[PDB]
């Protein structure tokens, strides 16, 4: 929306105006059910819960939730599309090797079923990870839904709502990769830059100005590490000639006009960056957390980028609000994909 600080409210509203179907494989997980209850009450999405119908209904009753009577519940052991989904899974895993017998096992795994629902067009997005490892969430996602065209990996971005309104869009920047890839290749780093810029435009209403960060600015501190960022910058520009991407540059050159004017003259990014691309996961994971904690920024994420259809992974330590927000964001990813 017009102010970057109001983005979460805008995300919720956008979801409400165009209701999407979101699958929650963790249909008995309490925080997930609490979130689903509020989401359904607020008309944000149409919820699909995975689990034994009697078990799920009993859990809803046990937690005292009142807004989930009209939620779709699908039992992985018994539902109308079970054989169809089994055959689809076999088709996908035919070359790598999957027998009918163990396809029949896997289709009853809620995480696999969830991905097959989305892949089949019977839902618009999936969220899990409140009671599953990231690895266990991502494995069926990458096996069944897969990465989007051109993308060889997925990455995680955060909305960083900072108290420095003079930077980004009223203090908001997107930053990546903060979750997935330990040490991106130049090619992987270029993918991250393009994906994060696309996410920024599509979901956050930001006109991207993408800074490829380094301890060097435009050859000030040459090093093999610096070379990787330089190459990633060139590769990202080739991938997406429409985007404003520049690098390599230090964090102060990215944000501060005075510094940019000296260290990166004429740059279309330096001094007004609103998307920060970190060279490694050590940088990404440490830096966003320190900006959050030491800077009192609000960090919303991780938002997964590069999947062929919207899949997000929650922290196992997530709050109910975290789930509510990430479901709304998942819906916005789906809406964006449909409008483009």
What is d(CA 47, CA 49) in angstroms, rounded to the nearest whole number?
6
CB of 279 to its own copies, least distance (A): 5
Contacts with its own copies by CB under 8 A: the residue count is 42
State yes or no: residue 116 binds its own copies (CB under 8 A): no
Q: Please list, in sequence order, all residues whose beta carbon lies within 8 angstroms of the beta carbon of residue 262, skipping any fewer than 6 positions away.
A: none
Residue 280 within binding range of its own copies, rule CB under 8 A:
yes
Q: What is the DSSP string of 161-223?
A: E-S-TTSTBTTEEEEE-SSS-SS--HHHHHHHHHHHHHHHHHHH----EEEEE-SSSTTTT--
CB of 163 to its own copies, least distance (A): 6
Count of CB atoms situated within 10 Å of the CB of 184: 25
Q: Is 218 in the site for its own copies (CB under 8 A)?
A: no
From the list 307, 311, 302, the residue with the least C-alpha distance to 128 is 311
Hey, what are 79's tokens?
């539902």
Closest CB to its own copies among 85 and 278? Answer: 278
Q: Does 281 bind its own copies (CB under 8 A)?
A: yes
**Is 154 one of the annotated binding-site residues?**
yes
Q: Measured in whole angstroms, how far is the alpha carbon of residue 11 from the centre of its chain?
A: 14
Tell the residue number behind the tokens 């203090």, with chain if given: 171
CB of 300 to its own copies, least distance (A): 15
Starting at the edge strand found earlier in the chain, the sheet holding 125-128 runs 72-74, 46-50, 21-24, 125-128, 311-313
- Contact present, 296 and 163 (Cβ < 8 Å): yes
**Nearer Cβ to its own copies (249/334):** 249
Q: 316 labelled as ligand-binding? A: no
Residues 231-260 that bind its own copies (CB under 8 A): 250-252, 255-256, 259
Of 67 and 285, which CB lies nearer to its own copies in the complex structure? 285
Q: Should residue 183 be labelled a site residue for its own copies when binding is judged by CB under 8 A?
A: yes
Query: Does residue 213 bind its own copies (CB under 8 A)?
Result: yes
The answer to whether 269 contacts its own copies (rule: CB under 8 A) is: no
| Share in percent of the chain as helix, strand, coil (round to 5) | 45, 15, 35
Annotated ligand binding at 31? The verdict is: no
Closest distance of CB 307 from its own copies, Å:
20
Chain Cα centroid distance, residue 23: 15
Q: Whole-number minimum distance, CB 204 to its own copies, in Å?
A: 16
Q: Which stretch binds its own copies (CB under 8 A): 10-18, 65-73, 91-99, 290-298?
A: 290-298
State the Cα–Cα distance between residues 7 and 326, nearest whole angstrom. 13
Structure tokens at 141: 């996602």
CB of 297 to its own copies, least distance (A): 6
Binding mask 138-177 toward its own copies (x if CB under 8 A, else -) reads ----------------------x-xxx--x-----x----
Q: Is residue 202 annotated as involved in ligand binding?
A: no
Please tell me whether 139 is known to bind a ligand: yes
The alpha-carbon radius of gyration of the chain (Å, integer) is 21
Nearer Cβ to its own copies (85/167): 167
Cis peptide before 189 (omega within 30 of 0): no
Establish if 318 lies at the interface with its own copies (CB under 8 A): no
Backbone phi and psi for residue 319, each to the nearest 5 degrees, phi listed first:
-90, 170
Known binding residues for acetyl-CoA are 93, 96, 139, 154, 179
Known binding residues are 93, 96, 139, 154, 179
Applying CB under 8 A, the residues found at the interface with its own copies are 160, 162-164, 167, 173, 182-183, 213-215, 221, 223, 225, 250-252, 255-256, 259, 262, 276, 278-287, 289-297, 317
């Amino acid at each position: 929306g017009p102010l970057g600080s109001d983005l979460i409210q805008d995300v919720i509203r956008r979801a409400q105006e165009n209701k999407q179907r979101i699958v929650l494989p963790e249909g008995l997980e309490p925080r997930t059910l609490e979130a689903a209850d509020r989401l359904m009450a607020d008309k944000v999405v149409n919820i699909i819960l995975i689990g034994n119908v009697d078990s799920v209904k009993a859990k809803v009753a046990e937690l005292g939730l009142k807004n989930l009577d009209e939620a779709v519940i699908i039992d992985p052991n018994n539902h109308p599309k079970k054989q169809q989904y089994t055959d689809l899974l076999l088709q996908i895993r035919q070359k790598k090797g999957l027998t009918p017998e163990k396809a029949a096992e896997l289709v009853e795994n809620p995480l696999y079923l969830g991905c097959l629902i989305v892949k089949s067009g019977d839902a618009d997005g999936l969220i899990a990870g409140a009671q599953n490892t990231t690895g266990d969430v991502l494995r069926p996602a990458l096996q069944v839904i897969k990465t989007a065209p051109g993308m060889t990996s997925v990455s995680g971005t955060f909305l960083l709502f900072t108290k420095a309104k003079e930077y980004g869009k009223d203090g908001l920047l997107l930053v990546a990769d903060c979750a997935v890839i330990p040490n991106p290749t130049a090619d992987e780093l270029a993918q991250i830059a393009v994906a994060t810029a696309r996410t920024a435009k599509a979901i956050a209403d930001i006109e991207p100005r993408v800074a490829m960060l380094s301890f060097s600015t435009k050859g000030s501190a040459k090093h093999e590490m610096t070379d990787k960022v330089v190459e990633a910058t060139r590769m990202a520009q080739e991938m997406a000639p429409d985007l404003l991407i520049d690098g390599e540059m230090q964090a102060d050159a990215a944000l501060v006009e005075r510094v940019a004017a000296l260290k990166a003259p004429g740059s279309n990014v330096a001094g007004k960056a609103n998307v920060l691309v970190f060279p490694t996961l050590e940088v990404g994971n440490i830096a966003y957390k320190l900006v959050e904690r030491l800077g009192h920024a609000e960090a919303v994420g991780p938002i997964l980028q590069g999947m062929a259809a919207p899949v997000n992974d929650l922290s196992r330590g997530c709050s109910v609000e975290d789930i509510y927000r990430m479901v709304a964001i998942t819906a916005n990813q789906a809406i964006a994909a449909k409008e483009q």
